[PDB]
């Protein structure tokens, strides 16, 4: 599988340095160029720089020339992007892109993209979430379908991953975007609509993963 | 640096209609170095068109790229509800490889009233000294919906927070989640907790309530 897999989420104090990984699989990594792009929450894409295949010759935008260093490692098939002198405006999702290649030929554009690495810059400390059940009841049933969910509350920073029944349940799931509470922590809710007759004979577990705090919680939501 | 300007900022179209997106550069860029990307909610960007008019692998034939010099066009012949996303153009023949501000494509559909569900706070949260009451508005259109909280017929304002999902890729509906936050002490003093929902799909406001 032609893949580009970046590292996990980050929390960095203002003034520190972050180094995002970007490991390749499936294609000839040494033949492939690599560009780096970021995007702040609710903004447009911002090009950072790119590196030529084979050598370490890189080229950066003037905005990131002074504090961004794009490297690559042919032995471990991983490209890196290190951003020093981190400030508040650097909080964004950083992507790596590359054309797929075999031993001799390459694509003419960047078609392979990483899933993105979310980097948050703040003095606030990391905090794991509390997962509470949104239990189904008579006041959450309409027709033959019932709604249940999980409240992922009081965590920092973004993001969190929520799946249901280890990914076996996707139909009818709505994971809402987080809101920034007045306390400085985030709070998220994920819900799913299921038939009412399944509540007694089918178990429902929301899988919550907050990588910045190494917090994995499997909360079972039971009827009330 | 080459400036890339996309217009319009947002395009709301019915499924089956033809979408038209503009990408313009402050100077002439080589056509083989202009790319179009598609970024759907919660996903990485996806290469649609490269070389101005060459569809990438796996891209359906309803996507079409055209233009040259300083004016480039993306065309979606028959718009499908799955095509909702932000579409970016990028030039990568002259450093810096600048991007456009992107064009957001929404899908139009018939009015759909929401389904309202309310969730009392769990006993586990009540042990922490806080109480969260959640109101769920499920699968509605248009996105405009009013959610008011009442606690013993006292209108709550300033202590609730809402959140709306992106438009669903299948039925083109939205879903909202409002969370009322009260202290465990304040939550135990009252009985009737209700969220009232006003929406275009409802003849009159719908109220979902429970007694503590
Ligand atoms: C590399 O891919 C091209 C197609 O782009 C193909 O024509 C060529 O034979 C391939 N070579 C090798 C060594 O895989």
Residue numbers in the entry:
A (entry chain H): 1 to 224
B (entry chain L): 1 to 212
Sentences from the paper on this structure:
S is the major surface glycoprotein on the SARS-CoV-2 virion and is involved in viral attachment to target cells via the interaction of cell-surface-expressed angiotensin-converting enzyme 2 (ACE2) with the receptor binding site, at the tip of the receptor binding domain (RBD), in the S1 fragment of S (Lan et al., 2020). Following attachment, cleavage of S releases S1, allowing a major conformational change in S2, exposing a hydrophobic loop that executes fusion of viral and host cell membranes, releasing the viral genome to initiate viral replication (Walls et al., 2017). In-depth structure-and-function analyses of 27 potent RBD-binding mAbs isolated from vaccinated volunteers following breakthrough Omicron-BA.1 infection reveals that they are focused in two main clusters within the RBD, with potent right-shoulder antibodies showing increased prevalence. In summary, we have presented a structure-function analysis of potent human antibodies induced by Omicron BA.1 breakthrough infection in SARS-CoV-2 vaccinated individuals.
Omi-12, the most potent of the set of 28, belongs to the IGHV1-58 gene family, which has been isolated on several occasions following SARS-CoV-2 infection. It is anomalous in that it cross-neutralizes all VoC whilst other IGHV1-58 antibodies lose activity against BA.1, and this potency is recovered by somatic mutation. In a set of potent early pandemic antibodies, the IGHV1-58 gene family was the second most highly represented (4/20) (Dejnirattisai et al., 2021a); however, they constitute only 1/28 in the Omicron set, and it is notable that other IGHV1-58 antibodies such as AZD8895 and representatives from our previous studies such as mAbs 55, 165, 253, and Beta-47 show large or complete loss of neutralization activity against Omicron BA.1 (Dejnirattisai et al., 2021a). The structural basis for the retention of activity of Omi-12 on BA.1 appears to be a somatic mutation in the HC CDR2 loop (V53P), which allows the RBD mutation Q493R to be accommodated. (G) The somatic mutation V53P contributes to re-folding of the H3 loop so that Q493R can be accommodated in Omi-12. Omi-2 belongs to the IGHV1-69 gene family but has features in common with Omi-12, the only member of the IGHV1-58 gene family found in the set of 28 potent antibodies. In particular, Omi-2 and Omi-12 have a disulphide bond and Pro and Phe residues at the same positions in the H3 loop which mediate interactions with F486 of the RBD; these commonalities appear to drive Omi-2 to adopt almost exactly the same pose as Omi-12, which differs from the other potent antibodies that bind in this region.
